[PDB]
Each structure stands twice: as structure tokens, then as C-alpha cells.
Design a protein around this ligand. Structure first.
Ligand SMILES: Nc1ncnc2c1ncn2[C@@H]1O[C@H](COP(=O)(O)OP(=O)(O)OP(=O)(O)O)[C@@H](O)[C@H]1O
Lengths: 196, 314, 96, 96, 70
């Protein structure tokens, strides 16, 4: 009969702890940010104020699901982690580049269509297609047509929009969004703007 | 039976309560600000800087082992007294005929890597590196990572100066390289007073750790007479001219990891297109595989290679 | 053109985007750019790259002007004394 | 003033960030209807109370607003001369 | 014919704060670091003791003026 007593005791420590645990988030200095990294005898958190803090106590929540880099609920003043928190054209409208069209197809959709043959032959299709040439030699149009025909999710990227660690975080967020969906078409325009 | 669940229940009743104590105890640490030991002002106090930028003077708490807290050491300080706490630092022959490669290169790369006693008794400083030159690609792009295979150790690929960061980074990674004596630094595609200054790191700046820093790359258009002088650059190895039989061997090597009928007239294929380059033969194999992918042929038919051979010949 | 360039990196692109949004909200709007050579009328982009801010601002401008889905009701006029200095990207028809 | 960047079911738990200091997980102020709170628009939060007290209208960026001419100079084509062809070409691209 | 080695020997068997650090610096942003260095060395010189400097390959900086407009 002492078993229910201990389990009724559980409605005891949890209630007070919950109240305190549900203040750091609400409090203004929450500074919810990304955990720089993790260690063991512990957390390292880069607060959204551009400050690196070291927490001996790795955090109230168990450390197994503290992935290096993720929304971290830094406490208002202790800066300890509290909660993870939630995270129209056709290929008949362009000429003079048909060979490039089939090359891009066989390199970009063939993995989408069937990749078994590539594994059978022991050669995998490279990832990432570069479109370089004079500003006139159409490639934005080719990319738009390919996206329109093939059914996937477009990911439009530009040098100016990315730049503002804002650039790195935005790039990581977009790439993660692409990773989440199995079909993904990633368009980076004037890539020379970033990779200077 | 009715007691078995009670036993397990007990473990549960403690488990949730177990966390309460862990949570409560964990519910007090105030964290700390991370910084670096900028300098050791005194055995009792040292100058440090938090990542935020402000610089203070702090001291060891009880025993921070100043012997190991040399200038530059991550440490977390409490934002109530600024005291030092826990410190935490945060194919052997893929080109067919490689007799040229497995010969002078080996005898000049590993020989100075094993027995420094031999040369120091001879009184001659071991050669620090040799330069390879010849056709780009096969001799330059290829067989560059292969050197690690030949020596069986991981190497570092290093791709007047902006701020001298070339030499600066070279030296800063030199200690890491020296930490692994078998490691070899391969500053391929290396390309005033930086290249010439580049001639001074090899003499000193921690170059007594038995590593052959082979400056093997045809990329640098300008050649330094002082470097090619005996000592610095012991000797130069010219990438051998493919004989169209080494091409056959390369095709066979790359034909290995390929699914095909087997009735491949490799000699006919090599005669079809003179790619001349190991990467050209790689492209040949890739194009044959692609042609096979056309019509969905798990194998590769004979004509597919010929189309691949013809395509690269263009 | 000077009002576009600012001390902070990328601010010019932000203001260009703001102007584009304001135009998009409105209907039947005409825009006139003067001293276009001022606003990134070059692409030398040497190793020093001191013009990187104006360059990225101009890239954002051209991208928002044409590409993917423009408004199609934005009549753009441009007055420059020496267009020869202008970059190929803007001078190419479709944008102008 | 703060900008909302997300919301969550059950307790709203907005992830608003004020200007650039930091993202704050703040609950709505007591005296606000939950309908008004939405994503990606200006709102008002107090420092200590940390809570969204009143929705705000979108940013106007007065530089862009005053950039608009909002004035018609007293110039007519009659005064201009010798550019009849150019006048017609511009008209075909702006007015007609 | 024996130069850099002589300077090296002087460095090895001296007591001054020999700071060569004179990499021929064309540079593009900081131009005229002469005073930036010598003063430091003089500041070093009085800081500890008189210093010495040494370098070759200064032939580029030699020149003879000539045009003043290009
Ligand atoms: N071969 C072509 N067929 C059809 N339209 C073309 C072709 N080449 C260029 N274009 C025209 O150019 C545009 C296609 O994208 P665009 O030319 O802008 O991209 P690009 O030439 O690769 O370089 P950039 O995107 O930098 O301008 C459309 O206006 C399209 O009509």
C-alpha cells in the first residue's frame, strides 16, 4: 500500500519544479539560442546576445537529446537549458541547349526517377549542378522549366537575400528544410555573390 | 503475480522522484562566462578575456594547475567574482603502371621517414621533399591522395601574400603535422617574398621531426632556383608519359567496380579513344555506366563503352 | 543613389527590397533611377572587393527587378551619363 | 516594438524577437484577445512584463515613404522640343 | 657568397633584441610601415636594450624616384 503513497508523493516535487521551469522561457532574458556544444564531467550555449556561456549542469532535461546545435532554452539568469522548443514552362520552349537539358535531366531526375541502376553499375550521380556562362545563355529559365515539369519542392536561394551569423543560420535552416523533404530542388542564383 | 508489478512499480515510483532531486539540484547552477587566458600576469592573478570582449584580471580558485594554463586556455568564470573554474579545450596503383610512382617517390618519401640515425650519422639533413611535374590530371590531379595509400598515413592537402597568412597557417598547422611523424604534408597546387620566405620555413620553424614535405605540383609556373638547389628540393620526378598500355591497366582498374557482361575488348576500347589521362579513363567508365543507364541496362554492353570512348575523344 | 548606400553591410539591399515591396503594394507605379552608375554600375570585383556592399545591393536590385515572378506593372526608367560603365547584367534586355 | 516569428498551439508560446537582441518565448498579455496575435507582424511587449500588450501596425520605413515624389512639377511636353521620336518611344512604354 | 648566414650568426651570438621581421611588404592597405616597425624597435630598444635590424632583397624599394605622377 506504500506504493501509492510514493506515486501520490510524485504529485509533490514535480509541481513546484514545473512552476520554476516554466519561468525561464517566459522571462524576457530567456535568450533562447543555440547550444554551442556538449561535454561531460555539461553544456556550452551561445546566447542570442552573441555571448558564450558554459553551464556545468548540462541542463534540467536529460542530455541524450541535446543535439550539438539546436533551439536551446537558456535560462534568464542561470542560462541553463530548459526546453528544446519547436524548431509554368516545358522543355519545348528553349532551343540550342537540348544536350545540356538531357545532361541536367540524367544528373538531377534520374536519382529521383530510379537510382538502382547507378548502384548496380557502382557509380553514383554527383550532387550539385553548376550553370556557368554569359548572362544571355539561359539557365534561370532552364531551372524554372525543370522545376515546373518535375514535381518537387523549389528552394530559391540568392546571394543578396542570404547575406545580412545570420547568413550561416539562414543557410543551415534552408538546407535542413530541404533535407526534411525527400524531393528537393535547390536553386542558388548569382552564387558568385556568396562564394567570393 | 500481483506482487511482480509492485516490484517494478517501486522502481518507477523512485524513478520519477529520482528526477525531482536531480532536477532540483540541477535547478541552481548559474552557469559561467567562457573566456581565454590572455596572459599569466602572476602566479596568483592572470589576464583573461570573455568571449563577449571585455578583459579582466582573475585568479585560480583553489588549484587550477597553472602549469597547464599557458597563455591561451579556455576557462569559465562565474559572473559574481570572476574566478577561474573548470578548464576545457574547445588503391596502391590506380594509374595502372606506377613503377615511376612506386620507385623514386617511395625511396625519397619513406627512406627519410624511418631512420634519421642513418643520415645524422652521415651528417646530412634528410631531404625535405621532392617535386613532381608532367601531364596535368593523371600526374597532378590524380595520384595525389594516393600518396597517403603508398605511405599508409593520413596527409594534409594545402591548396606578396595577403597578410602572410600562407606561411602563418603553414607554421600553425606544422605542429599538428609534426604530432604525427608518419604524416606527410602535400602542398599541391601551391600557386616576391612569400615563396622565397616559403624557402625559410623548411630550414627551421620546427622542421626537425622526420617528415618529407614534398612540394610536388606542376601548378607553380615560377620555379625558384634556390629551391631546386640540392638540399631543399632533392630531385625532380617527371610524370611518365602514358603509353596506351598503362591506359589499358587503368581501364581495367576502373572496370573493376563496374557491372558488365565481361566480354570487354579493353584493347579495342583503349584504341578507340586516347584519353591519355587516368581521369579521362574515369570519365570513360562513367560515360559507359551512363549509356548503360540509358535503356536501363544493369550491365554495360560493349557498344556502350565505345560510345563512352568516342564521347571523351571529343 | 547615395541614400541607398549605408555604412552597415547589406542595408542597401534591404532598402531596395523595401522599395520593391512598397511598389508591389501599390498599383501602376513608375520608378525613375538616376545616376545608376552610382548604384553598383561596375563588376570589376577585384581581390580587394571594397565595393562588395554596393555590389550585393545592386544584385538584390536586379534580382527583384526581373526573375521568377515580377509584378509586371512596374515601369522603370533610368538616366545615366555614361552607360558604357554599366554592368552587362542590368543592361541586358528583359531587365531593361 | 517586437516582431513575431512563430506561434504554437496550446499555450501560444510565441518566439518573438524585439529588434535584434534575442528571441524571447513570451506569452500573450492578459488583456489581449488571442485572435489579434498572429505571425510576422509588429506588436508591443513591455520589458519586465515581457508580454505582448497591443498589436502594432506594420513598419512604414519613412525614408521609403518620403522617397515617393508626392508632387507634380509644372513641366509639360510642350516646353521640350527636338525629341518627338524619343517622347513617343517613352510614351509607348509608360503612358499608352 | 655568405650573407643571410652571417646575419644569422650575428643573431646567434649577440645580446640585442634582433627583430628582423622585415618581409618585403608591398601591401595594399597599410602603406609605409617603416615607422610602424622602427619606432616599435626603438620602443623595444629602450624597453630592453638597443636592437639591430637586417635584411636583403630590399633592391625593389631602392628605385630612383624619376616620375612623380603615375
Ligand atoms: N535558349 C533560350 N530559350 C528561351 N529563352 C531564353 C534562352 N536563352 C535566354 N532566354 C531568355 O532569358 C531568360 C532566361 O533566364 P536568364 O536569361 O535570365 O538566365 P541566364 O541567361 O542563365 O542568366 P541570368 O539568370 O544571370 O540572366 C528568359 O527571358 C528567356 O526568354
Amino acid at each position: 500500500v506504500l506504493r501509492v503513497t510514493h506515486e501520490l508523493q510524485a504529485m509533490k516535487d514535480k509541481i513546484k519544479e514545473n512552476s520554476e521551469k516554466i519561468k525561464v522561457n517566459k522571462t524576457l532574458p530567456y535568450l533562447v539560442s543555440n547550444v554551442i556544444e556538449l561535454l561531460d564531467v555539461c553544456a556550452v550555449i551561445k546566447t542570442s546576445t552573441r555571448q558564450t556561456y558554459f553551464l556545468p549542469v548540462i541542463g534540467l532535461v536529460d542530455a541524450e537529446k541535446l543535439k550539438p546545435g539546436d533551439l536551446v532554452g537558456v535560462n534568464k539568469d542561470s542560462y541553463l537549458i530548459l526546453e528544446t522548443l519547436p524548431t509554368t514552362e516545358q522543355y519545348s520552349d528553349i532551343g540550342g541547349l537540348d544536350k545540356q537539358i538531357q545532361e541536367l535531366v540524367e544528373a538531377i531526375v534520374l536519382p529521383m526517377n530510379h537510382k538502382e541502376k547507378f548502384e548496380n553499375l557502382g557509380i553514383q550521380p554527383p550532387k550539385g549542378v553548376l550553370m556557368y556562362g554569359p548572362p544571355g545563355t539561359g539557365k534561370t529559365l532552364l531551372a524554372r522549366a525543370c522545376a515546373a515539369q518535375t514535381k518537387a519542392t523549389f528552394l530559391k536561394l540568392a546571394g543578396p537575400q542570404l547575406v545580412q551569423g545570420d547568413g550561416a543560420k539562414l543557410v543551415r535552416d534552408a538546407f535542413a528544410l530541404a533535407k526534411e523533404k525527400a524531393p528537393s530542388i535547390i536553386f542558388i542564383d548569382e552564387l558568385d555573390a556568396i562564394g567570393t | 503475480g500481483r506482487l511482480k508489478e509492485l516490484r517494478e512499480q517501486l522502481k518507477e515510483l523512485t524513478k520519477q522522484y529520482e528526477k525531482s532531486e536531480n532536477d532540483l539540484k540541477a535547478l541552481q547552477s548559474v552557469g559561467q562566462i567562457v573566456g581565454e587566458v590572455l596572459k599569466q600576469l602572476t602566479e596568483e592573478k592572470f589576464i583573461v578575456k570573455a568571449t563577449n570582449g571585455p578583459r579582466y584580471v582573475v585568479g585560480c580558485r583553489r588549484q587550477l594547475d597553472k602549469s597547464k594554463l599557458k597563455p591561451g586556455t579556455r576557462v569559465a568564470l562565474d559572473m559574481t567574482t570572476l574566478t577561474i573554474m573548470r578548464y576545457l579545450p574547445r588503391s596502391y596503383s590506380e594509374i595502372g603502371g606506377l613503377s615511376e610512382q612506386i620507385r623514386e617517390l617511395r625511396e625519397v618519401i619513406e627512406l627519410p621517414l624511418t631512420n634519421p640515425e642513418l643520415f645524422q650519422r652521415v651528417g646530412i639533413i634528410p631531404p625535405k621533399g621532392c617535386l613532381l611535374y608532367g601531364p596535368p590530371g593523371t600526374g597532378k590531379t590524380l595520384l595525389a591522395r594516393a600518396v597517403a595509400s603508398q605511405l599508409d598515413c593520413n596527409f594534409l592537402k594545402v591548396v606578396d601574400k595577403y597578410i602572410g597568412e600562407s606561411a602563418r597557417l603553414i607554421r600553425e598547422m606544422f605542429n599538428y603535422a609534426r604530432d604525427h611523424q608518419p604524416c606527410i604534408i602535400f602542398m599541391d597546387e601551391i600557386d616576391q617574398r612569400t615563396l622565397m620566405e616559403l624557402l625559410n620555413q623548411m630550414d627551421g620553424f620546427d622542421t626537425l621531426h622526420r617528415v618529407k614535405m614534398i612540394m610536388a605540383t606542376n601548378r607553380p609556373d615560377t620555379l625558384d632556383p634556390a629551391l631546386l638547389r640540392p638540399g631543399r628540393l632533392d630531385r625532380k620526378i617527371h610524370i611518365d608519359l602514358p603509353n596506351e598500355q598503362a591506359r589499358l591497366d587503368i581501364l581495367k582498374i576502373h572496370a573493376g567496380p563496374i557491372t558488365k557482361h565481361g566480354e570487354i575488348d579493353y584493347e579495342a576500347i583503349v584504341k578507340l579513344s586516347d584519353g591519355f589521362n587516368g581521369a579521362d579513363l574515369r570519365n570513360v567508365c562513367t560515360e559507359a555506366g551512363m549509356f548503360a543507364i540509358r535503356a536501363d541496362h544493369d550491365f554495360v554492353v560493349q557498344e556502350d563503352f565505345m560510345k563512352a570512348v568516342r564521347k571523351v575523344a571529343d | 543613389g547615395s541614400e541607398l548606400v549605408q555604412k552597415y553591410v547589406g542595408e542597401g539591399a534591404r532598402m531596395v527590397r523595401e522599395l520593391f515591396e512598397m511598389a508591389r503594394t501599390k498599383k501602376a507605379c513608375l520608378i525613375f533611377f538616376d545616376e545608376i552608375d552610382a548604384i553598383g554600375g561596375a563588376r570589376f570585383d577585384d581581390g580587394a572587393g571594397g565595393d562588395n556592399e554596393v555590389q550585393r545591393t545592386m544584385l538584390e536590385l536586379i534580382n527583384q527587378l526581373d526573375g521568377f515572378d515580377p509584378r509586371g506593372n512596374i515601369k522603370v526608367l533610368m538616366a545615366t551619363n555614361r552607360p558604357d560603365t554599366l554592368d552587362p547584367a542590368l543592361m541586358r534586355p528583359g531587365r531593361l | 516594438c517586437t516582431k513575431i516569428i512563430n506561434a504554437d498551439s496550446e499555450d501560444p508560446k510565441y518566439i518573438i524577437n524585439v529588434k535584434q537582441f534575442a528571441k524571447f518565448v513570451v506569452d500573450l498579455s492578459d488583456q489581449v484577445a488571442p485572435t489579434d496575435i498572429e505571425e510576422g507582424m509588429r506588436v508591443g511587449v513591455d520589458r519586465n512584463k515581457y508580454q505582448i500588450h497591443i498589436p502594432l501596425p506594420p513598419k512604414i520605413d519613412p525614408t521609403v515613404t518620403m522617397m515617393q515624389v508626392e508632387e507634380k512639377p509644372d513641366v509639360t511636353y510642350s516646353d521640350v522640343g527636338g525629341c518627338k521620336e524619343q517622347i513617343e518611344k517613352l510614351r509607348e512604354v509608360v503612358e499608352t | 657568397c655568405g650573407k643571410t648566414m652571417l646575419a644569422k650568426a650575428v643573431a646567434h651570438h649577440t645580446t640585442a633584441a634582433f627583430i628582423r621581421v622585415v618581409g618585403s611588404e608591398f601591401v595594399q592597405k597599410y602603406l609605409g610601415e617603416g615607422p610602424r616597425m622602427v619606432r616599435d624597435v626603438f620602443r623595444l630598444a629602450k624597453e630592453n636594450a638597443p636592437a639591430i635590424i637586417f635584411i636583403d632583397e630590399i633592391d625593389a624599394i631602392a628605385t630612383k624616384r624619376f616620375d612623380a605622377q603615375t
